[PDB]
A paper describes a structure:
Overall with the crystal structure of the [name] complex, it was certain that the [name] biological assembly unit indicated with [name]:PrpA2:[name] contains two [name] monomers, which were isolated from each other, and a [name] homodimer. In other words, [name]:PrpA2:[name] heterotetramer is maintained by one single PrpAFL homodimer interface formed by N-terminal PrpARHH domains and two [name]-PrpAFL heterodimer interfaces, which is similar to its structurally relevant complex, such as CvParDE, and consistent with the conclusion that [name] dimer interface and [name]-[name] heterodimer interface with an estimated CSS (Complex Formation Significance Score, calculated by PISA server) value of 1 contribute to [name] heterotetramer complexation. The C-terminal [name] neutralizing domain (49–85 aa), which is also the tetramerization domain, is connected with the C-terminus of the α 2 helix by a hinge region composed of AGS triad [Figure 2B (upper)]. That is, the [name] binding could result in the dramatic flexibility-to-stability transition of PrpACTD, which provokes the de-tetramerization of PrpAFL antitoxin and the rotation of PrpACTD by ∼80° around the AGS residue triad, further leading to the extra interaction between [name] [name] and RHH domains of [name] homodimer. [name] and [name] interact via two hydrophobic subdomains surrounded by electrostatic interactions.
In this study, we reported for the first time the high-resolution structure of the [name]:PrpA2:[name] heterotetramer and two forms of crystal structures of truncated antitoxin-PrpA2–54.
Numbering used by the authors:
A (entry chain B): -5 to 86
B (entry chain C), D (entry chain A): 4 to 98
C (entry chain D): 4 to 83
Write the structure that this text describes.
């Protein structure tokens, strides 16, 4: 990274549960995949593929669920952020 | 003042967006992101010409981008009504 | 027991959108759905898959005497 | 002394198993795990009766568990020849 700049790599820490964890481990140890990350990405590609053809239906459903969620009410930024602070200690 | 109202589910979207940002980036960035969404909401409530026509999803639906998100809303007599705020990955742009 | 993974930007944003929509509760739930699909894809062909791994072993060269001391020395030498 | 030889890919399996354990748990646990595998290899080289018949995968193939892994091997005149060491999630037990 050039000086005065920072890494912008972005990971996530996930709990796969024991059954799927062992599944991932076996795939890496067999040499079929190089890392846990490669296995997880293959899974996410399949999940993205499964729903790729129905994005319009999916968005309609999210919009409809918004429409059906109750009458609209006023928005206040400061009240929202107060409510967020009230949920627990906040830092950074 | 132009009207600005939000469906309950849109408020819950904002909470989830805030929490997601907070986990990743901390308070200052997450609150700023909400503030930027708020600034966008105010602009859209004032200017009908900004709204992107999203009839192809639902008649009368409008969209507008902010950051990595899209505000989905309807025009009212006096302003806008926000229905959902969704990540841009959920978009279905007009073909 | 968690794992820290790099999904790359495209799939990371894919995961974020699904959590923020409320469709899934956490990043973990999204990842688990993906892994279920991957497990499902191969679930019906475990015998062929094992045969392939065994064959790849058989075809990997002449067997050599197991030398535990050499192995552990090699492991130490990598990134001491 | 019974003989014990490994295919090159089985030795590479052991490296991957070592690295996986090392990343998660550190040196001591990874070395212990390899020690357990080594102790099992020695036991299998000594006692033909321990080997599980895995003809249903390949004729003459044998399996034996250690920890969360399976040693796949063949009997030789003087001991064993290890073909792969795989996580038990890769197993296909006899129908």
């Amino acid at each position: 990274v050039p000086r005065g700049s920072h890494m912008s790599s972005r990971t996530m820490t996930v709990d796969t549960g024991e059954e799927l964890r062992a599944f991932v481990e076996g795939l890496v140890e067999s040499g079929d995949y190089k890392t846990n990350s490669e296995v997880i990405r293959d899974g996410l590609r399949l999940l993205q593929e499964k729903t790729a053809g129905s994005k319009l239906a999916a968005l309609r459903q999210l919009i409809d669920e918004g429409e059906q969620s109750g009458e609209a009410v006023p928005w206040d930024r400061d009240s929202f952020l107060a409510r967020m602070r009230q949920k627990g200690p906040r830092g950074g | 003042a132009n009207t600005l109202v939000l469906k309950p589910r849109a408020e819950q979207d904002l909470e989830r967006i805030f929490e997601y940002s907070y986990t990743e980036f901390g308070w200052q960035q997450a609150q700023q992101y909400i503030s930027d969404l708020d600034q966008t909401f105010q602009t859209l409530a004032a200017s009908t010409d900004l709204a992107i026509n999203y009839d192809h999803v639902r008649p009368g639906l409008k969209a507008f981008p902010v950051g990595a998100h899209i505000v989905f809303f309807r025009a009212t007599d006096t302003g806008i009504e926000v229905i959902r705020v969704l990540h841009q990955s959920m978009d279905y742009p007009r073909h």
